[PDB]
Design a protein around this ligand. Sequence first.
Ligand SMILES: [Cl-]
Ligand SMILES: [Cl-]
Ligand SMILES: [Cl-]
Ligand SMILES: [Cl-]
Ligand SMILES: [Cl-]
Ligand SMILES: [Cl-]
Ligand SMILES: [Cl-]
Ligand SMILES: [Cl-]
Ligand SMILES: [Cl-]
Ligand SMILES: [Cl-]
Ligand SMILES: [Cl-]
Ligand SMILES: [Cl-]
Ligand SMILES: [Cl-]
Ligand SMILES: [Cl-]
Ligand SMILES: [Cl-]
Ligand SMILES: [Cl-]
Ligand SMILES: [Cl-]
Ligand SMILES: [Cl-]
Ligand SMILES: [Cl-]
Ligand SMILES: [Cl-]
Ligand SMILES: [Cl-]
Ligand SMILES: [Cl-]
Ligand SMILES: [Cl-]
Ligand SMILES: [Cl-]
Ligand SMILES: [Cl-]
Ligand SMILES: [Cl-]
Ligand SMILES: [Cl-]
Ligand SMILES: [Cl-]
Ligand SMILES: [Cl-]
Ligand SMILES: [Cl-]
Ligand SMILES: [Cl-]
Ligand SMILES: [Cl-]
Ligand SMILES: [Cl-]
Ligand SMILES: [Cl-]
Ligand SMILES: [Cl-]
Ligand SMILES: [Cl-]
Ligand SMILES: [Cl-]
Ligand SMILES: [Cl-]
Ligand SMILES: [Cl-]
Ligand SMILES: [Cl-]
Ligand SMILES: [Cl-]
Ligand SMILES: [Cl-]
Ligand SMILES: [Cl-]
Ligand SMILES: [Cl-]
Ligand SMILES: [Cl-]
Ligand SMILES: [Cl-]
Ligand SMILES: [Cl-]
Ligand SMILES: [Cl-]
Ligand SMILES: [Cl-]
Ligand SMILES: [Cl-]
Ligand SMILES: [Cl-]
Ligand SMILES: [Cl-]
Ligand SMILES: [Cl-]
Ligand SMILES: [Cl-]
Ligand SMILES: [Fe+2]
Ligand SMILES: [Fe+2]
Ligand SMILES: [Fe+2]
Ligand SMILES: [Fe+2]
Ligand SMILES: [Fe+2]
Ligand SMILES: [Fe+2]
Ligand SMILES: [Fe+2]
Ligand SMILES: [Fe+2]
Ligand SMILES: [Fe+2]
Ligand SMILES: [Fe+2]
Ligand SMILES: [Mg+2]
Ligand SMILES: [Mg+2]
Ligand SMILES: [Mg+2]
Ligand SMILES: [Mg+2]
Ligand SMILES: [Mg+2]
Ligand SMILES: [Mg+2]
Ligand SMILES: [Mg+2]
Ligand SMILES: [Mg+2]
Ligand SMILES: [Mg+2]
Ligand SMILES: [Mg+2]
Ligand SMILES: [Mg+2]
Ligand SMILES: [Mg+2]
Ligand SMILES: [Mg+2]
Ligand SMILES: [Mg+2]
Ligand SMILES: [Mg+2]
Ligand SMILES: [Mg+2]
Ligand SMILES: [Mg+2]
Ligand SMILES: [Mg+2]
Ligand SMILES: [Mg+2]
Ligand SMILES: [Mg+2]
Ligand SMILES: [Mg+2]
Ligand SMILES: [Mg+2]
Ligand SMILES: [Mg+2]
Ligand SMILES: [Mg+2]
Ligand SMILES: [Mg+2]
Ligand SMILES: [Mg+2]
Ligand SMILES: [Mg+2]
Lengths: 173, 173, 173, 173
Amino acid sequence: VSQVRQNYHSDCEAAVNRMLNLELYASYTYSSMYAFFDRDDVALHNVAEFFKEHSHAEREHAEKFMKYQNKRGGRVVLQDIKKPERDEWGNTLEAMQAALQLEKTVNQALLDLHKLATDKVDPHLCDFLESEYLEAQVKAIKRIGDFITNLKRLGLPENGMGEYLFDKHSVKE
Amino acid sequence: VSQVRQNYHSDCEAAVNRMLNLELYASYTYSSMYAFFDRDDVALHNVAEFFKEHSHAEREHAEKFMKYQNKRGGRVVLQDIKKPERDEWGNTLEAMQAALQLEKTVNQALLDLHKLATDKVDPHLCDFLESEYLEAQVKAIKRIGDFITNLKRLGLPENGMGEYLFDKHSVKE
Amino acid sequence: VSQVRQNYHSDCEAAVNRMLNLELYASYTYSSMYAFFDRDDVALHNVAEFFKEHSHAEREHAEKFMKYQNKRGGRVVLQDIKKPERDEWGNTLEAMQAALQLEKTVNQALLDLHKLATDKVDPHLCDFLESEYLEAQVKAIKRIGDFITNLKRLGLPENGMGEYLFDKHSVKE
Amino acid sequence: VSQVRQNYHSDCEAAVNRMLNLELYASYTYSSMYAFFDRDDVALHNVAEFFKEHSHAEREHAEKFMKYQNKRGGRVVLQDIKKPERDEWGNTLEAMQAALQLEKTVNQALLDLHKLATDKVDPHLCDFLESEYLEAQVKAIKRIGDFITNLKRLGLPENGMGEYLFDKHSVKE
Ligand SMILES: [Cl-]
Ligand SMILES: [Cl-]
Ligand SMILES: [Cl-]
Ligand SMILES: [Cl-]
Ligand SMILES: [Cl-]
Ligand SMILES: [Cl-]
Ligand SMILES: [Cl-]
Ligand SMILES: [Cl-]
Ligand SMILES: [Cl-]
Ligand SMILES: [Cl-]
Ligand SMILES: [Cl-]
Ligand SMILES: [Cl-]
Ligand SMILES: [Cl-]
Ligand SMILES: [Cl-]
Ligand SMILES: [Cl-]
Ligand SMILES: [Cl-]
Ligand SMILES: [Cl-]
Ligand SMILES: [Cl-]
Ligand SMILES: [Cl-]
Ligand SMILES: [Cl-]
Ligand SMILES: [Cl-]
Ligand SMILES: [Cl-]
Ligand SMILES: [Cl-]
Ligand SMILES: [Cl-]
Ligand SMILES: [Cl-]
Ligand SMILES: [Cl-]
Ligand SMILES: [Cl-]
Ligand SMILES: [Cl-]
Ligand SMILES: [Cl-]
Ligand SMILES: [Cl-]
Ligand SMILES: [Cl-]
Ligand SMILES: [Cl-]
Ligand SMILES: [Cl-]
Ligand SMILES: [Cl-]
Ligand SMILES: [Cl-]
Ligand SMILES: [Cl-]
Ligand SMILES: [Cl-]
Ligand SMILES: [Cl-]
Ligand SMILES: [Cl-]
Ligand SMILES: [Cl-]
Ligand SMILES: [Cl-]
Ligand SMILES: [Cl-]
Ligand SMILES: [Cl-]
Ligand SMILES: [Cl-]
Ligand SMILES: [Cl-]
Ligand SMILES: [Cl-]
Ligand SMILES: [Cl-]
Ligand SMILES: [Cl-]
Ligand SMILES: [Cl-]
Ligand SMILES: [Cl-]
Ligand SMILES: [Cl-]
Ligand SMILES: [Cl-]
Ligand SMILES: [Cl-]
Ligand SMILES: [Cl-]
Ligand SMILES: [Fe+2]
Ligand SMILES: [Fe+2]
Ligand SMILES: [Fe+2]
Ligand SMILES: [Fe+2]
Ligand SMILES: [Fe+2]
Ligand SMILES: [Fe+2]
Ligand SMILES: [Fe+2]
Ligand SMILES: [Fe+2]
Ligand SMILES: [Fe+2]
Ligand SMILES: [Fe+2]
Ligand SMILES: [Mg+2]
Ligand SMILES: [Mg+2]
Ligand SMILES: [Mg+2]
Ligand SMILES: [Mg+2]
Ligand SMILES: [Mg+2]
Ligand SMILES: [Mg+2]
Ligand SMILES: [Mg+2]
Ligand SMILES: [Mg+2]
Ligand SMILES: [Mg+2]
Ligand SMILES: [Mg+2]
Ligand SMILES: [Mg+2]
Ligand SMILES: [Mg+2]
Ligand SMILES: [Mg+2]
Ligand SMILES: [Mg+2]
Ligand SMILES: [Mg+2]
Ligand SMILES: [Mg+2]
Ligand SMILES: [Mg+2]
Ligand SMILES: [Mg+2]
Ligand SMILES: [Mg+2]
Ligand SMILES: [Mg+2]
Ligand SMILES: [Mg+2]
Ligand SMILES: [Mg+2]
Ligand SMILES: [Mg+2]
Ligand SMILES: [Mg+2]
Ligand SMILES: [Mg+2]
Ligand SMILES: [Mg+2]
Ligand SMILES: [Mg+2]
């Protein structure tokens, strides 16, 4: 037993490792989206940069779980980071729809971990999730949903002018 | 009788209380418009913020009537603030059309109060309305009318690209 | 279903709308207290300003619930804002006693909403209440209680000199 | 006829001269109050300074009527400035009560002049009164009324401690 460990269930330790992996998986998916929108035959650079930044944020989320694991006396156990589900992402609308679903998948895993922490009477882990993850996730989901609404309004997928306008006026330039 | 009261007719006092209520009603309607445009399935945030700011301005108009009532020695009497006429506002054009009509309703009440003040030979109340309300109202009506003209030019309600462009280029970002 | 909605029970959505209304009701009550203490025959302007500021804070609390509702994919539904229970507030002690009871009523509604969120296993809503409302409410209740103790010490309601001194030395000038 | 005169009735010209005199009379009354509160056996120096400043304001009001008369092509005609009604002013409450009545007397004369200007269809004179006099008068009346309420609360005339406290905490130090 680690000398620091106190009130930290094995099941929570394992679930933190699985969360770590999911954040890295999300990072990798966003990096694929970045590379897609940077292609010369796609060429939506503000969209590309939105996804690149989101890829970096997900890696930071993973690193924070590594630090957490060690603070509690658990042990980081890594697994392969699976490649993203697609090699090409269609257009801004398809990518944003995939991002929404990814963020909801990550959110569900965070909520499931919170429920496990509750069941194991681990208020430190509950606080960590509430203070560092759950609100960021709700904000990200709302932002992407708002974008999808605007992309539909702009006539995606068919309306290329609408897609251009979104890249120039909705995503940080 | 209040020790400060001079040349202040009971009818004017009552009409100031009714005006106070109407300004609060207008504030509440604009707050509903804010919440509508902030929905994830509407997502026109500059439009939402335009209405939020207008909601705050109307509350300030109400507070100025409270202060006025007390300065003249009248007594503030509050009534329920009725909920807005609609729960959802359609789109930017429908909302702006409703805002125009609301501003004209408020303007008519201000003009009616000015006429009452004239009839009761109350130049202080006439000056207050002319100096603090009537020009602001004309300016607001002109601004909203100009917006409606532009929304129609942009093809509202059908043209979603036009609606997007209005949010990005006509309302403060 | 809203595209953003996840783990948000209909009962919580409805209870957030009812909370929104209660915050607006509290705002309106404080605005009535402001207007009362600004009367020429009351004339306790620091007390009046204390209540005016509290009225603005309550409106901010309501607006934060509107934003929350939309972030979760719920729908803001507004109801009439009922007028305050009294048209005149007696004196500083009576008003502060009414404010204490109002703050405790709002606190109880917040606690009830937290219990509902707990029952529906909604940690995001629990965090929101704990981080944005519950401590502010405890602080406000303590402040008003401290004021009541001092008003009683100063001989309210009978001791007008005590009431004057409170306005000049306990409330921000 | 003055080369500048246009739309300026003889009756209004005369009434402006009478107003000029009344403002000077009010100034002189306030100067008497200043001297009273500066007596060694009264010795309420913040109260004294309040009245001294008000004396200067009234003289400025008179000078503005002189300038107005000349701008319109009327002719300033001066009369004796009558001494104040009392040689001694009792205490802060009695003085403030006299000041309230004086301000209401001046207000009534301003309102009467506005009515004359209205009857003679003189919008420039109406604007001048509304823009330069009527609101200042309402503000002054409200301020003095608020003071009287506080002096009564403080137990004037009997409560000398209350009178001391008013001088130290209600009037600019
Ligand atoms: Cl342990
Ligand atoms: Cl334990
Ligand atoms: Cl264990
Ligand atoms: Cl593991
Ligand atoms: Cl694997
Ligand atoms: Cl996918
Ligand atoms: Cl693919
Ligand atoms: Cl997914
Ligand atoms: Cl889990
Ligand atoms: Cl726990
Ligand atoms: Cl967070
Ligand atoms: Cl957006
Ligand atoms: Cl957008
Ligand atoms: Cl009257
Ligand atoms: Cl009159
Ligand atoms: Cl009347
Ligand atoms: Cl009324
Ligand atoms: Cl009603
Ligand atoms: Cl409507
Ligand atoms: Cl509706
Ligand atoms: Cl209307
Ligand atoms: Cl009216
Ligand atoms: Cl008039
Ligand atoms: Cl105006
Ligand atoms: Cl325009
Ligand atoms: Cl453009
Ligand atoms: Cl425009
Ligand atoms: Cl749900
Ligand atoms: Cl869940
Ligand atoms: Cl549900
Ligand atoms: Cl509801
Ligand atoms: Cl109702
Ligand atoms: Cl009550
Ligand atoms: Cl009452
Ligand atoms: Cl209550
Ligand atoms: Cl509840
Ligand atoms: Cl929970
Ligand atoms: Cl809080
Ligand atoms: Cl205290
Ligand atoms: Cl003191
Ligand atoms: Cl205190
Ligand atoms: Cl003439
Ligand atoms: Cl003419
Ligand atoms: Cl003439
Ligand atoms: Cl003359
Ligand atoms: Cl004479
Ligand atoms: Cl006298
Ligand atoms: Cl005398
Ligand atoms: Cl008099
Ligand atoms: Cl006259
Ligand atoms: Cl005229
Ligand atoms: Cl003025
Ligand atoms: Cl005062
Ligand atoms: Cl005072
Ligand atoms: Fe993440
Ligand atoms: Fe994420
Ligand atoms: Fe208004
Ligand atoms: Fe308005
Ligand atoms: Fe543009
Ligand atoms: Fe509140
Ligand atoms: Fe509160
Ligand atoms: Fe003091
Ligand atoms: Fe004057
Ligand atoms: Fe005066
Ligand atoms: Mg060891
Ligand atoms: Mg284990
Ligand atoms: Mg996994
Ligand atoms: Mg594989
Ligand atoms: Mg629990
Ligand atoms: Mg937080
Ligand atoms: Mg946003
Ligand atoms: Mg009275
Ligand atoms: Mg009446
Ligand atoms: Mg009405
Ligand atoms: Mg109804
Ligand atoms: Mg103006
Ligand atoms: Mg313009
Ligand atoms: Mg949908
Ligand atoms: Mg429902
Ligand atoms: Mg309720
Ligand atoms: Mg009722
Ligand atoms: Mg806190
Ligand atoms: Mg304290
Ligand atoms: Mg000549
Ligand atoms: Mg003449
Ligand atoms: Mg005279
Ligand atoms: Mg004489
Ligand atoms: Mg006029
Ligand atoms: Mg004017
Ligand atoms: Mg003015
Ligand atoms: Mg004041």
